[PDB]
Amino acid sequence: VPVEGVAGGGTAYGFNDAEPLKQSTDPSEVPTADLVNVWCMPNTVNVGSQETPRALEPINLLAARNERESFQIAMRPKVSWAASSPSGIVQVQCSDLCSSAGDRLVVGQSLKLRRVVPVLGVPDALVPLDLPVSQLSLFPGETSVIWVSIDVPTGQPPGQYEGEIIISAMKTDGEEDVVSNLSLRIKLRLTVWEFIIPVTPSLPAVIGVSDTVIEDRFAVEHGSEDWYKKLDLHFKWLLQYRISPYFCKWGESMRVLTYTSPWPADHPKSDEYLSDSRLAAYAVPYRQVIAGDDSRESYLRKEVEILRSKPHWNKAYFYLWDEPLNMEHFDNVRKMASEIYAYAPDSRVLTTYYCGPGDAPLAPTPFESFVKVPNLLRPYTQIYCTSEWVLGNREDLVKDILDELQTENGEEWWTYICLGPSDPHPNWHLGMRGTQQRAVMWRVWKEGGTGFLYWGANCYEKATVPSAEVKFRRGLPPGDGVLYYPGEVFSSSSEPVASLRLERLLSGLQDYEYLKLYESKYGREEAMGLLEKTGVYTGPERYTLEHRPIDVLRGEVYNTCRP
Amino acid sequence: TVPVEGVAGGGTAYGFNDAEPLKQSTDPSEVPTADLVNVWCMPNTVNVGSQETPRALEPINLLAARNERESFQIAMRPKVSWAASSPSGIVQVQCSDLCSSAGDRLVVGQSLKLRRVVPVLGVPDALVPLDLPVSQLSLFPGETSVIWVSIDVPTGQPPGQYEGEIIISAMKTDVVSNLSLRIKLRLTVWEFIIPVTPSLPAVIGVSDTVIEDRFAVEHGSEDWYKKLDLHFKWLLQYRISPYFCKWGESMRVLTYTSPWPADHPKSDEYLSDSRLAAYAVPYRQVIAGDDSRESYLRKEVEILRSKPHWNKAYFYLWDEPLNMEHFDNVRKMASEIYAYAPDSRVLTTYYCGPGDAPLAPTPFESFVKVPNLLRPYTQIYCTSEWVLGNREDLVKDILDELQTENGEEWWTYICLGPSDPHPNWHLGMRGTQQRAVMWRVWKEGGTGFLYWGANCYEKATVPSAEVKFRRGLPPGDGVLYYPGEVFSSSSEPVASLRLERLLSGLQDYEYLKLYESKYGREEAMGLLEKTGVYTGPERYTLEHRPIDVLRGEVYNTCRP
Ligand SMILES: CC1=N[C@@H]2[C@@H](O)[C@@H](O)[C@@H](CO)O[C@@H]2S1
Ligand SMILES: CC1=N[C@@H]2[C@@H](O)[C@@H](O)[C@@H](CO)O[C@@H]2S1
Ligand SMILES: [Cl-]
């Protein structure tokens, strides 16, 4: 290109005319592909409105049984094909996937389409499209994105499954089917392999759900019939993310009422929740959920006598106090825990903490005082659930925490994340990149804790209408405590809307299961070696910025770990 | 050929090598692999030691049925050093899928496997996994190094003539080129399907105390259940039915195929598996609980009696009762069980009658009369093979005391006896000697087989600890697989050659049972002997070819 530009257009005029456009903009005569750039992107990219076109190629995926695998379709107009509301409408159609044996992954039960919608300017909200056929408006100078996910049943026959998604530019009012030789066809190939991801999650990830948020936003009084229906809706939706929900009400000095099941242990609904195979751990409340006639002592005695008989009792825990800060708080936990043990001695009490007692240090520095918390609490806490931020980037001080615990007597180390750690550590703050979100569970895996807790999934600012704007609480990084959105904000559905962050939590929990499989076959040192040598994850400040390492890892698990 | 003074005056016997000269280069980026390394194939029944002498390379022509493993070995011996600093050098091994003319495939993961043959106590025995499809092997001067190639044909595979290659490449120190040496594999998959359910129940014990000690897994723990689970699943590929085993006072045994309570979903995943021909039910509790021993037993049998797979149950209660008090504890124990289930099969191992009140004036005659003392409180009479010496004609004397039209069965076992030259699995015994265990079992016509132990090592407290053989026993007795962790980082068990010959033998039984089903007992017996495969306990083929003459004759005559 000369100094004066092609044909005298001036400086830098004509550096690629990326192939002349067709002179017509009529979608009934021009291929969709000459009207709109369409390409695929990996599930770990947060695909902004200004992402640049790439050339479309086929998509080749891998999934085990009981695994959700995902990819994205990006669309950016080249022209107006609807002069009067630019740029135009595209119709999106998907199809069953079919193997050689004639087995199928069906549209609707396995295969789903959602639009990726920005929250605070960042790609985050996944809003359902109509199946099998939907329409999507495309705007000038904007990249618009669809999240495709495929849920493989536990019983699915292995094989190579194949299918197509069809994108057609439409003329709006300026029947037939809209699909034609002018349509653009994206080719899908998924290999289902012999692994079944355990039905019961290997890592209990317990996630809190504010009941006050539900009570206010929906307008449902605690105890009511409508309240019980609303909590039911949330509990059932959340289990598909390989997590263990608990409802949570905060009290005086950060005491907590935490309950997985709002139903008395008597009720048939209690066993339907607690004996669900997908639920790895459930909170039992300390006080009564609904106002009773009994005293709490009296209620808890009778609740525990029932639950301790049931075969799911091994999944129970009590969570009594959120971040005890001072000596009175740590004493209160001992007292409450000992009431519990009098009705059943094998009860598991979960305590979260970032610090020893402020008013009576257990050692001359804060970190050292923190390390001794188990010496103070023993034997009145079983699950020592510590803040990851406390470690900074010192993965080598993990041993300092563990050296104070007694694994051989049922004590366990768990971790949580919250307003810290911050960039460039793994977390779920809005603005954090996709791999950074997924790296939360790579870190959890590497460090060797036996469960995980996240304080909040719906912890918005207060609102009194279902479709009210989602506002983020003051003093916290936006996204902290917020993994899903009300459906009514984005459509007329009552079904929750997932965040990208919740999808990358699930994918991370799927990765954990892969790495646990690899470990069960080749040992701890080899599996640690796989995580690092692939480039997936080296340390809290050093993990992959791209997708490809992740496929290298999951592909090596497939190559080596089949039966 | 050569004169007294040798070629060019090299001295006595110099220049008798007809080997054509070597190349003057040793650079493996320029010299064909075949000029740097001798490579040849051997049969699956040779124990190929480190001084096996090179043969000319030829094509491999194999036969298998559906649901059959077939095998061969690849032997490699360096001719020169191609890595001057670390002799002799490294070769890369690469396998590819096998394809028929119709386009069917036998695949590398699932079908074709490669393992290194490693010596144990100086004898070729352990089969240690190589990486697939590409592995590396260090070769050392003046030594023959050996790879075991096995091909598992799926039950549903299309008949056909499948073809492929294994490629061996000397490395410089992925790298395949025109210099690489190519071995040609041709496998005929024929019509026969080998029954999914083994036709002979071969029950194999697995010591639970060995697992608990060596892997540091507390009996009952969740880690223990995982460890037992891994062993069970791995052993079912060998056409055997495992049982875990703890010995008690005076050689009482607690035996159990499943560690899982009978109501647990995992119990029926094990016990209803089509490959499991017989399973052991424990007399007392595996995992200590609240119910007394009689209340546990009745509850368990009630659940099991109702299941479709209950015809496979048996109870193994005493290992080798030796005096009158032992034979009488068995009768008491059995009779307790018959109160809950009259139809239960009780299995008893023995080599002798009661020594303190003999049943007859000589020990062989006392042994033969054991069923008349135990009846009706044993249904499976499992007797020591060693007691017969080389007398196949005295089997009749055992069977004549049994009431086989009242579901009494005759099974056999081997152990520290019999010894050379009889068939057994003692380290040092020859390949076809190991395989002849099942030839003998077939010819003598018992309806089952038991082996006391497959992991019966001396005691150790770390997974990768040296494997030591128990005192007073021929090494290998009681040991058919090794810990994977001794040989790599893997938790998967390592098979012995002897376990592979056991499988080969069990596959031979299914070939002979097919020929019998078509042509009758007397023609089947004639086949076995007139091919040279097996004449009797001290006379059986020392070479592979008769085994192929036998299998090929079954293919030509039962190809329908
Ligand atoms: C277990 C936890 N306890 C605290 C919560 O109540 C919230 O304040 C949260 C905000 O990030 O921080 C920590 S995470
Ligand atoms: C059924 C058997 N019982 C005995 C076992 O307990 C071991 O002592 C073995 C040693 O070879 O010999 C016999 S075989
Ligand atoms: Cl055929």
Automatic annotation (TrEMBL), chain B:
Domain of life (superkingdom): Eukaryota
Pfam families: GH123_cat (PF13320)
Domain Glycoside hydrolase 123 catalytic residues, every copy: 294-514
Official protein name in the record: Alpha-1,6-mannosyl-glycoprotein 2-beta-N-acetylglucosaminyltransferase
